[PDB]
């Protein structure tokens, strides 16, 4: 999830997708690699 200025920080799976709900893009910013993003998103 994005607060006002959180996007300045480097992405982080725990902080953004597990401790918060994350969008497909936030997850992609964490993995960068498409297939990895798919693997994770499909099980999210």
């Amino acid at each position: 999830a994005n607060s006002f200025l959180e996007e300045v920080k480097q992405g982080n799976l725990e902080r953004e997708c597990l401790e918060e709900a994350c969008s497909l893009e936030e997850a992609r910013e964490v993995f960068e690699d498409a297939e990895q993003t798919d693997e994770f998103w499909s099980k999210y």
Binding site: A1, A21, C22, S23, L24, E25, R28, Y44
Partner: protein, 129 residues
């Protein structure tokens, strides 16, 4: 007075679909469900209120967004701009997914504020007729 499962507001019928589709497929889908259907067009304060509440009834996730009928038709990555120095854009190195020309609403704004999203993602949507 709409088809079964559709909600009325100002002589228009609306329906929230939980199936995830890209913006384009969602649009086609809407035109095939009802006579004159399209993705919802939020043309007023009241319509926004009604549709936001309508969506809130079916969609509870914050991991996704809900597609609405606004899109930039331009095929180019940016529109009518040059670099801050004056030179035109010859070179480009865009991540396909960073071009966000389709709009959608999210639960964190109560499904009101129009946010920019990459068109080829699959998300729920709302049809209006």
């Amino acid at each position: 007075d709409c088809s079964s499962g559709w909600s009325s507001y100002e002589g228009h019928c609306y329906k929230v679909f939980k199936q995830s589709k890209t913006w384009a497929d969602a649009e086609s889908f809407c035109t095939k469900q009802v006579n004159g259907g399209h993705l919802v067009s939020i043309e007023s304060s009241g319509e926004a209120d009604f549709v936001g509440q309508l969506i809130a009834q079916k969609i509870k996730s914050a991991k996704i967004h809900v597609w609405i009928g606004l899109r930039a038709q331009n095929k180019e990555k940016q529109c009518s701009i040059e670099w801050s120095d004056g030179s035109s854009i010859s070179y480009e190195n865009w991540i396909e997914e960073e071009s966000k020309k389709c709009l959608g609403v999210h639960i964190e704004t109560g499904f009101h504020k129009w946010e920019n999203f990459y068109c080829e993602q699959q998300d729920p949507f709302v049809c209006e007729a």
